[PDB]
Design a protein around this ligand. Structure first.
Ligand SMILES: COc1cc(C)cc2oc(=O)cc(CP(=O)(O)O)c12
Ligand SMILES: [Zn+2]
Length: 229
């Protein structure tokens, strides 16, 4: 079940995979939950996305120390908004190697974010160029095209049924596509479907603002995005 740890929530999704959840009271939008992932790969831990803030991200590291007690080898962050990169300084203070889409690192300063230390680049078909993602273990990084943002990336976990859509994917009952302020509305539907096609065996879809869902999250998100065109 859900584990409350200070102001954060942690939920085990698989033997080696947990979801981290943090909250930011955004004036005009309530207290918004954001989810990322924690993956144990043998004797090390890999993180997908920060929490909203440095303090919350340090608390993620504290939870990892108490519940897993292995070094965090790297973190990858999935676009240049605060819910995904707001805690970069906490990762750096902890000595953790950080990775983001090159475009996310380019956008970070203007978005008020600190850039990751390393830039991922992507082949024309969307798969990460492997030399830019060394030692990623089971994390398979895919750029599906522009959607929630132009830089949004996605992550599958090899050896599990889990894929992470970040803010690109909304749950199967969602009423809207959320914050479209930086979105590519023309390309969103295709990008959502490209995420599903990249991880065809993923039956558990994890996303930024809802609990994990079935693949109906992908079909429903794409069908809603069909309207934006
Ligand atoms: C940049 O961020 C946001 C901006 C605005 C105007 C509203 C928002 O409302 C949310 O609920 C979540 C976010 C972060 P997100 O776009 O999900 O990365 C958000
Ligand atoms: Zn965003």
């Amino acid at each position: 079940g859900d584990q409350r740890f200070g102001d954060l929530v942690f939920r085990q999704l698989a033997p080696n995979v947990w979801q981290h959840t943090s909250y930011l009271d955004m004036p005009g939008f309530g207290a918004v939950a954001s989810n990322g992932l924690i993956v144990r790969d043998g004797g090390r831990v890999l993180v997908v996305d920060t929490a909203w803030t440095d303090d919350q991200t340090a608390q993620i590291l504290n939870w990892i120390k108490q519940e897993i007690n292995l070094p965090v080898a790297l973190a990858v962050v999935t676009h240049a908004h605060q819910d995904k990169m707001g805690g970069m300084d906490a990762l750096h203070a902890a000595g953790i190697a950080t990775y983001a889409n090159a475009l996310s690192n380019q956008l970070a300063p203007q978005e008020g974010m600190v850039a990751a230390q390393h830039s991922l680049t992507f082949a024309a078909n969307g798969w990460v160029e492997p030399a830019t993602a060394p030692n990623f273990g089971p994390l398979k990084v895919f750029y599906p095209g522009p959607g929630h943002t132009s830089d949004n990336i996605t992550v599958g976990i090899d050896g599990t049924d889990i894929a992470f859509g970040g803010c690109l994917i909304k749950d199967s009952k969602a009423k809207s596509l959320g914050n479209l302020g930086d979105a590519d509305t023309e390309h969103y539907a295709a990008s959502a479907r490209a995420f599903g096609a990249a991880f065809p065996k993923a039956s558990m879809i994890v996303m930024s603002h809802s609990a994990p869902d079935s693949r109906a999250a992908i079909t429903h998100t794409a069908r809603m995005a069909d309207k934006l065109r």
